[PDB]
Amino acid sequence: MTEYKLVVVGAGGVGKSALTIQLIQNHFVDEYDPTIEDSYRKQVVIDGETCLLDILDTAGQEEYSAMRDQYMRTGEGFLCVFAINNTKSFEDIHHYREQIKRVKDSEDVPMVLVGNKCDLPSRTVDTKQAQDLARSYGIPFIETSAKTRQGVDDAFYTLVREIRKHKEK
Ligand SMILES: Nc1nc2c(ncn2[C@@H]2O[C@H](COP(=O)(O)OP(=O)(O)O)[C@@H](O)[C@H]2O)c(=O)[nH]1
Numbered sequence: 516m517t518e519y520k521l522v523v524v525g526a527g528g529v530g531k532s533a534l535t536i537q538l539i540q541n542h543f544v545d546e547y548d549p550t551i552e553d554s555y556r557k558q559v560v561i562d563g564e565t566c567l568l569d570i571l572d573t574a575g576q577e578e579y580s581a582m583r584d585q586y587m588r589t590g591e592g593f594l595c596v597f598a599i600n601n602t603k604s605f606e607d608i609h610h611y612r613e614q615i616k617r618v619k620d621s622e623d624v625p626m627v628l629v630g631n632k633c634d635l636p637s638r639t640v641d642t643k644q645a646q647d648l649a650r651s652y653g654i655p656f657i658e659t660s661a662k663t664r665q666g667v668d669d670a671f672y673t674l675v676r677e678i679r680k681h682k683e684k
């Protein structure tokens with residue numbers, strides 16, 4: 516069994532802690548503290564390969580920038596989640612990609628763009644806008660919802676393959 520370290524990044528409220536729990540507990544949580552950081556391990560067999568997923572739900576700001584950059588260097592796959600009804604989070608995805616790339620000092624980093632809250636209206640971020648950004652980074656983009664669980668599993672599954680491609684490259 517191969518172990519995969521994945522970190523979900525985004526703004527406070529995009530639903531990172533919801534997506535992570537949806538894969539672990541298999542149930543949506545309407546109320547959960549965003550500041551509480553917790554990493555979960557899940558044994559899944561994708562593509563015939565049994566892999567243990569180590570997903571960490573970060574809060575945002577760390578006490579020490581040292582450990583902050585550290586948790587960004589140990590991660591092999593990073594899930595970029597934003598809210599389609601919150602352009603503020605989508606625009607922050609720009610600095611998120613930039614930062615992590617500088618932390619690991621690389622050009623090619625296994626990442627996936629995820630647009631959560633697709634079930635909710637007031638869609639400020641259009642699909643094309645996100646796809647355009649993803650296209651620039653050279654990574655896949657998937658619209659999801661932690662409520663109805665649409666594309667949530669697929670997003671994680673895709674990230675795993677993204678990591679693999681970088682490993683066999
Ligand atoms: N309606 C809706 N709310 C969501 C969704 N995902 C997360 N939320 C809500 O976003 C708020 C914060 O969730 P939280 O677990 O803190 O996620 P995070 O802090 O963004 O990582 C809570 O009200 C969650 O129920 C979603 O997909 N749909």
Ligand SMILES: CN(C)CCCN1c2ccccc2Sc2ccccc21
Nearest residue numbers: 520521522554569570571586589590
């Ligand atoms: C403590 N270990 C059993 C889990 C560590 C998980 N971890 C994390 C997970 C995936 C990529 C990077 C990181 S760095 C980090 C930071 C805080 C807590 C746990 C971790």
